[PDB]
């Protein structure tokens, strides 16, 4: 089998999920020994770091925390596009992809397919293709919760699908 470094690469929009879904959620995957890359620890800039790319490609899953401005980031799309690269190239074992909607409707993130005109012409294409697949794929659908449980559901359901 190819070399896997995390079990999870953890995308996510900081300014929308940070405090605290995605800051708890990525202590309780570890908390369940899902080893996990978070994609926030690196300096920005203008090119996504090489050192990211190179970490998704030895993740074996990808989870996306899609929010309302997610799909409104020229860096989380560009990230978003080689997620979904390896999920369709990677073999022995492949790269999954597990998308959660934190208080947005997958019907919403769809419509943003349509809509990067007025979020921002060569990289749309792309970015529609990798937003497009990874919206239809099987994930979960949160609305307002009791986030802490929902976190506790989330992990433990990619334990089982993982671990």
Known sequence: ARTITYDVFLSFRGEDTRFNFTDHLYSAL???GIRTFRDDKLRR???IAPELLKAIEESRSSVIV???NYARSRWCLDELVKIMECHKDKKDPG???FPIFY???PSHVRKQEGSFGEAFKDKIPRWRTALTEAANLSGWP???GYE???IKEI???IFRRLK
């Open 148 to 150: 802490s449980n929902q």
């Open 155 to 157: 992990t433990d359901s």
């Open 66 to 68: 899609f929010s309302e």
């Open 30 to 32: 570890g908390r369940r």
């Open 142 to 144: 949160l609305q307002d």
């Open 95 to 97: 790269h999954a992809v």
């Open 45 to 47: 800039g203008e090119a």
């Open 103 to 105: 208080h947005v409707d």
